[PDB]
Symmetry: D2
Subunit: 417 residues, 4 copies
């Protein structure tokens, strides 16, 4: 019987086991033998077939029959990448031929899919067929607008529940939380958690008009929201910050971000966006009775058990991968569009300028973004022109109306309105 | 004086009602509007007594609604009181709305609530009052573009999956079959969604039956064949999900057997009381007569009322926030006798009459599309005997032996089921 | 060779079974022991065929058990297969245990499982095998020091609270009464725990009835009085929790009415089949006849099987970890024919005889102490008519008027209820 | 009718609303009038009766009938403390007399109870034990309300991190907020099966050294690595910081002078224990294939909806507070022992050396602690004396057995065994 081998690459997202089980169960009904490589390409890169065998398992019915309930991945994952070296690509081809892998399914992000196609491009199309399922919790695949990537619904819903606890705690014991949503690629996750939880502010890189963000502008955007709520008798709230703000900051802004220090270098992971903003804002607003606390939301989302939407999603994706194998497809990506799972050739999704799959960002001109903005607390252009409002907010910050306009009014040209 | 927006809920609750109330109220308050909420739908507006109505209306202020987007249920309650049947009741509602000076009238409910709102508007000046309705249903049976959900459906399906998960662990830990009955007779979206997400071994919905009337025997044998096939592979346990809509598709003879070979109950006016039917219980009793000797135990379990007021999941929180906003936007844009729906990520008003099926006069009901690829995929991961399976003699011999019967007896009893449901 | 520890589960699952298996296995593996798990309790050990037993036994290795403490259910399954009835079955078990060289034998189950393990041990030499059982019950009916819980009870009570919460929101959003029936006929701990935690408006357990046999009419009137008192305060909705144990205290006459004025169903041996009773459904029908004119809707709802394999809450995870460790410690100290329980924060072995009530021959049943302060506090927050309430003429006039009857008719019908339940 | 006034003090814990509703509902059945002071003692401390009145609300049936389902506190809370100044103590008594409060119920931890008695020594005062840290001096094995809820949610968060650390091999250093005791850290760790837990109670010496904490985590990571596991989860009570010596704190803050408030006390809130340990350990172990990530668990626990144990607990506590008022008790704390709620005089709970409420810590000599320790990965004394094991772990750390013993063996005198 033909051999299907499956591996996972990149950082996990809820529903990985759903894809493994959808593909495995269907393949077993077809009579296929299914094996799973542990930790992605890590051991296939060595080329030693004995080492690979020690880190491959038989994906049987009993193993996968109920993993659709479970977050994580039973075959683990790694960022080991064979595409960088032609020796590594040939080591992967050597082990795949030794195991008689007829069908090769990878579940991972762009780097994982590119590794799978590079292994196939130097391999006979009759002995091996390669299919990849695009993975990302960030919702940044170029699907039709409003259609989600798998795992995003689970991450957003758990993020809403965590922020709910922080909303009740900030009101019960007046304080501001600056929640930092991990993920620098796009603002879908930060804005989704914020809108669902009714957070009082959300800042994503997509809403900044200029190409480079300044540290001062971010501080003042949060400062204005705190003062406006304070003018309405509320010295507490929650502000959600997409970590992608850091990757859009200028060189000078990053210098201030790291404590007026030289930014580390080989390193945006060492940055503490929420922490730095909390310190600066306490300098400016602590005298007003405002306390501010940072809080990161990230790793606890990646392996939460999938919600029903993602369970159905990944079951259909696993099926579609096997169907693509049956219909002779190769070097294709299994995506779901308009309720239909279908294979799409890797190059059809690539952005020519980058060489990787195109990144779908938050559309800040859409009506959905304007609706989310409506339920946030913030000073719009019209608000700065409302003199009664400006007088109350300035007085809340213990400053003259002219000083408030002098400091904050320019922010209407920093972010879309 | 600021314009008055009045809000009410009609029909059975669904997760996210408070999200629609809060989206409309918060945005309206930023516009300077005064917002009031009628308690229990049309119940008190139908009396015509303005004193009674005011005793059951409340001021929807910022503090009241500022955080109800986290909460299931509806803070202004709901009712199935329906003024559309009587012009006296329709005029009583108009009388109280004029007394309260309602400029904008938002109803949140199902089909009957929207039809009541439009009937109240047709005898009302479009300049004094504007009426908008937001369609509600956990059953996912609104005619939205295919595969796009109605609000509340995601929450109900996800909680249904988690309950069935516990029943899947229990059925395997202590081998047994659960016959889960998903409440709701309108369509099979909810039953099939819970079943596919939870990996249930079978799902039966009215949509998959080819004939216009289902027979009680056919339903019993469809579950029986699944139990026997599982038993042939060494598994004397499982979970089968049943849409309650199977009952409303059954023939007269089938309903007689369903109610215990007794006369089906009827209301004073002469309507069969299908709520008193216990589909999962009756099927469990019959199947225990046939399969108990094989070591099979079967237990029914209903999933229904515990879903209606669960706290909304994030998808429904975003959904209902956008719907509440879209209702206020529709009022601002001069729309009336319209329904706020979301299509391809865009909330927009759609005239009530544009959504009516001309042959019926009511809104068209979207059922599960059993020809779609989604249904075919869900069916793949169920345990069942397909057309191809009945022609496989090796498999048929294994299943027949599991049921302690000859292969010829197995084909005689179960093979006809391929003409009962689409394949 | 390393000593062999064999583990099995019997009876119905409870949250934390996997915690006991993993606590015992991990500690034993650090001692160098070999650990095996029998699938489905005594089911296959009863055959006596060593090949069949091996086909349904697995090696409990570190990898198998390292993370099952998060999971409800039992990875080695369970059954009520019971060798205590036959020494042919007991000797079939003894033959397979000797063949597998089981030095230590841990069973996790109820009375039937522990009694089976000791009967198998009494006909073996104390040098070749040592037997320890861990008592299991989700009902909280072990004779531990008062208010100290059995493992699994916290998980079941907490999930029951969450289900009832959704029903409390739904009953208020769409005015109606739910009659929630907490499955389990042994005691009232589970029903009372869910009700008090959820703030349910009434809870009825068999323990609070003074007489030895309950009458169907009295139960109907106790719920009726609560509904009428709530109605007198403007509340035509609520939730009432009923322990299924009420059925097992009902008289022959009460059971006749319960089953529809029919002869109660019976098994082949002539014993009554109380599982076929639908307590919540029957009370809902009767109460709708009496109160439907008042605008009251009543709906039954069962809570049972979805609790048994929910993932354990932290209290039960720590609990079952300590029990599994304590079982290995008991083996190390030479104990046998002992039960591993936790008392006053200390896991200890307790000889079978200390827990047996001579009248039953099985472990003593700890019921709810209706004289305790905890029960009196729970009763305070319920809606009900106390002795003093019946003496309050103003209150009786409001409640009777709520039921559309005279104060004398209300007192004549309901006042006797003060002698039916403890006050 | 008699007036019952209720307030909450300290950081929120799940079940606060349960106490308010238990006391209020029962008091309303007695015909009492119930009021709630917003934000604890904050406004009572001012002495301005006008300000206090603006921040009190009427606790009616409709307000409290269903708040037992809700985390947080509807009357908010604060750490405002009148015991520090006798002028403030007289301000609190002045406002209570002005409002004619006959019964005064405070809901909080040790700091709140000690504040209530200073007002009481010169109206009836009762306090209800609140703390997610479980550090009130209740009878042994009896939890404070909120502890069950916080421990159970912490277990669920750590579960997601356990699946993620195994799916994508890495170590998480979870920092459990709370410096008073180790009940919360040990509870979350034992329930979740975390591979290590470090609490201040297990250190023998009065002052902890930064190097020893690093090496205790290092030894666990190396022992796991010797058994084929390059991943895990370690839970750390942040109270380790409050036991560190002056030198340890210097290294903790980046070899800088520890930050300080105007009075000269160290600002331990600004410390990042988990991050600092993660940086040091990655320098030492990154070459072995070890990744390490810090993660804080704290503020998201404080206002989770109460679990059933805490709902029943706080209902009985609220009832017991009213019963104590009816029976003439004052200056007492409502505790539950053997299923019986009873008042216990404040002075019986004071530690004679301190004059403040006694703090109950984890008993590291108990059998419960020894059992939790059994399921942790660590090197005991006997392990360091096991020559075969020491050689396996040292080889895992790429060092000689002699180098391993020289570095780690002294740790048996650092923590209890
Ligand atoms: N930035 C904001 N985000 C959300 N709600 C707001 C915001 N600003 C005000 N609100 C809400 O608007 C409602 C109406 O407020 P108000 O009567 O002061 O006039 P407004 O039209 O909102 O003011 P302005 O146009 O100056 O922002 C209040 O309930 C307030 O909570
Ligand atoms: N109805 C079903 N639903 C889901 N999985 C099934 C079903 N029937 C069989 N399977 C699974 O399909 C896999 C293959 O089964 P099996 O060996 O019987 O099929 P086969 O190789 O096609 O042979 P045969 O033609 O004899 O059926 C097994 O793991 C079985 O569990
Ligand atoms: N520190 C530890 N904490 C928990 N389990 C452990 C620890 N060290 C080893 N184990 C587990 O102990 C089991 C037995 O391992 P092994 O045979 O090496 O003996 P050991 O437990 O180290 O004891 P001994 O010192 O008596 O040889 C293995 O499954 C291993 O996972
Ligand atoms: N049986 C009961 N259980 C709980 N609360 C009650 C009960 N009876 C009355 N109450 C409440 O007690 C308060 C005083 O009632 P009354 O003395 O009748 O005005 C009101 O808030 C009532 O709603
Ligand atoms: Cl990663
Ligand atoms: Cl994180
Ligand atoms: Cl309804
Ligand atoms: Cl309906
Ligand atoms: Cl069972
Ligand atoms: Cl605080
Ligand atoms: Cl302790």
């Amino acid at each position: 019987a033909p051999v299907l081998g499956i591996l996972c690459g990149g950082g996990p997202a809820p529903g990985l086991n759903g894809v493994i089980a959808g593909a495995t169960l269907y393949a077993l009904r077809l009579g296929w033998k299914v094996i799973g490589f542990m930790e992605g390409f890590k051991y296939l890169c060595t080329g030693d077939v004995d080492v690979v065998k020690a880190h491959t398992i038989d994906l049987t019915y009993d193993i996968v029959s109920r993993i659709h309930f479970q977050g994580g991945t039973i075959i683990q994952t790694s960022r080991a990448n064979p595409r960088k070296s032609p020796e590594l690509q040939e080591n992967v081809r050597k082990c795949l031929r030794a195991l008689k892998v007829r069908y090769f399914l990878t579940i991972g992000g762009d780097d994982t899919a590119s590794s799978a196609v590079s292994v196939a491009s130097g391999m006979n199309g009759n002995e091996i067929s390669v299919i990849s399922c695009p993975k990302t919790i960030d919702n940044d695949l170029p699907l039709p607008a409003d259609q989600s990537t798998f795992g995003f619904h689970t991450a957003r819903s758990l993020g809403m529940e965590i922020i709910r606890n922080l909303m009740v705690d900030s009101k019960s014991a007046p304080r501001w939380f600056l929640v930092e949503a991990m993920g620098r690629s796009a603002g879908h996750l930060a804005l989704g958690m914020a809108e669902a939880s009714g957070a009082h502010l959300c800042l994503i890189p997509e809403e900044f008009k200029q190409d480079e963000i300044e540290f001062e502008d971010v501080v003042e955007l949060v400062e204005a929201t705190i003062l406006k709520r304070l003018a309405y008798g509320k010295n507490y709230g929650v502000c959600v910050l997409a970590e992608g703000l850091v990757s859009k900051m200028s060189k000078k802004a990053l210098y201030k971000l790291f404590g007026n220090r030289e930014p580390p270098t080989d390193l945006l992971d060492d940055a503490e966006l929420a922490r730095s903003l909390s310190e600066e804002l306490l300098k400016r607003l602590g005298n007003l009775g405002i306390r501010i606390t940072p809080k990161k939301i990230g790793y606890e989302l990646r392996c939460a058990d999938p919600v029903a939407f993602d369970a159905v999603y990944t079951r259909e994706l696993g099926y579609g991968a096997i169907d693509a194998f049956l219909n002779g497809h190769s070097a294709a990506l299994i995506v779901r569009e308009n309720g239909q799972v279908k294979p799409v050739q890797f190059k059809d999704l690539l952005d020519p300028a980058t060489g990787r799959v195109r990144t779908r960002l938050v559309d800040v001109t859409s009506q959905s973004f304007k609706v989310a903005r409506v339920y946030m607390w913030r000073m719009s252009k019209k608000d700065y022109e409302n003199k009664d409002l400006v007088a109350r907010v300035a007085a809340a910050g213990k400053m003259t109306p002219e000083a408030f306009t002098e400091k904050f009014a320019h922010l209407t040209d920093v972010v879309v309105e």
